[PDB]
Amino acid sequence: NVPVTGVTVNPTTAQVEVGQSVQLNASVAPSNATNKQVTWSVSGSSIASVSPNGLVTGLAQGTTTVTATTADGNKAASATITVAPAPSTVIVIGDEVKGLKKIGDDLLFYVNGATFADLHYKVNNGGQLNVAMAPTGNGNYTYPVHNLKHGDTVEYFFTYNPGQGALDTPWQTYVHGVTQGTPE
């Protein structure tokens, strides 16, 4: 009855963090077109995911292209999606003695004021890993865990002696880009 003549996508560009969303909208012309259905597609599916109604979710750093195509006409229009890297900030999750710093997509585990310090940790459903943490050379220790992705669950505790004798901390859970703390 009333054929589509064209389509547009708004917003025309967008920037999202990994795990963060943005809603795209197809405007079909004319307004009283009989069939206004669109199909949403993405050329860089590693970088961003698109829902059946144009919700775009950032997965990995990069720039990709998200298209609406009309069932009637196969008129196409596109937005450019930029998935940003993690802010280059330091988030402290712990106290004066022990804990971790979120440093983009790495964690820096620390123990301060110890005669020794080990770390026991499991990433998601992977294996338990055990490590002696590295002495900074002044009585404190660091150990980095590398290249965490959004929604990673890290379970960990420490064995250190702070002067009175060896102790285990309790099991703690960190979920990457969910668990919060204090900027450094």
**Piece of the chain touching a second copy by CB under 8 A; list 28-36, 91-99, 148-156, 162-170:** 148-156
**Piece of the chain touching a second copy by CB under 8 A; list 30-38, 69-77, 91-99, 161-169:** 69-77
Q: Does 130 bind a second copy (CB under 8 A)?
A: yes
Cβ–Cβ under 8 Å, residues 118 and 130 = yes
* Planar angle of CA 89, 168, 160, nearest 5 degrees: 70
Residue in 1, 31, 34, 125 binding a second copy, rule: CB under 8 A: 125
**Cα 91 from chain centroid (whole Å):** 15
Rounded Cα distance between 172 and 122, Å, is 11
Tell me whether residue 2 or residue 131 sits nearer to a second copy (CB atom): 131
Please provide residue 30's backbone torsions phi and psi, each rounded to the nearest 5 degrees.
-70, 170
DSSP state of 142: E
* Shortest Cβ 48–Cl ion spacing (Å): 9
Tell me whether residue 86 or residue 97 sits nearer to a second copy (CB atom): 86
* Shortest Cβ 76–a second copy spacing (Å): 5
Q: Does 106 bind a second copy (CB under 8 A)?
A: yes
**Residues in 30-49 that interact with a second copy by CB under 8 A:** 39-47, 49
**Piece of the chain touching Cl ion by CB under 5 A; list 12-20, 50-58, 64-72, 170-178:** 64-72
| Secondary structure of residue 112 in the 3-state scheme | coil
DSSP state of 3: -
> Is the bond preceding residue 144 a cis peptide, omega within 30 degrees?
no
Binding residues for Mg(2+) are 64
